[PDB]
Structure 1
């Protein structure tokens, strides 16, 4: 019943999904503190901003 510590998934080339070749493949969060690079997590029903907890659905 020992509780194993959570391990972060070491994903290969996390940078190489928001750009082409130019434009932003993901959305940009329109808040004041976040923008110009804060890409927007696109889950199968929603979008989330990972810094200031913006929520769109």
Structure 2
């Protein structure tokens, strides 16, 4: 039952999925500190901002 430390999933080129060719494939955080680059996590039911932690469903 030894506690193994968590290891981050090193995904190849995490940046290369929010754009085309131009536009934003993910929407933008509408907050004050967040926007114009703070991209929106889109899980299968829900939406996440990684800085200010807004909960959008």
Once the two structures are TM-superposed, the CA of residue 48 in structure 1 deviates from its matched residue by 0.5
Q: Where in structure 2 are there 5+ consecutive unaligned residues?
A: none
2: CA distance between counterparts of 1:21 and 1:6?
Answer: 35
- Give the TM-score normalised by structure 1: 0.98
Alignment: residue pair count: 57
Q: How far is the alpha carbon of 1:7 from its aligned partner?
A: 0.1
What runs of 5+ residues in structure 1 fail to find an aligned partner? none
> CA separation in 2, counterparts of 1:36 and 1:55?
19
**Length-normalised TM-score, structure 2:** 0.98
Shift of 1:32: 0.1
CA RMSD of aligned residues (A): 0.4
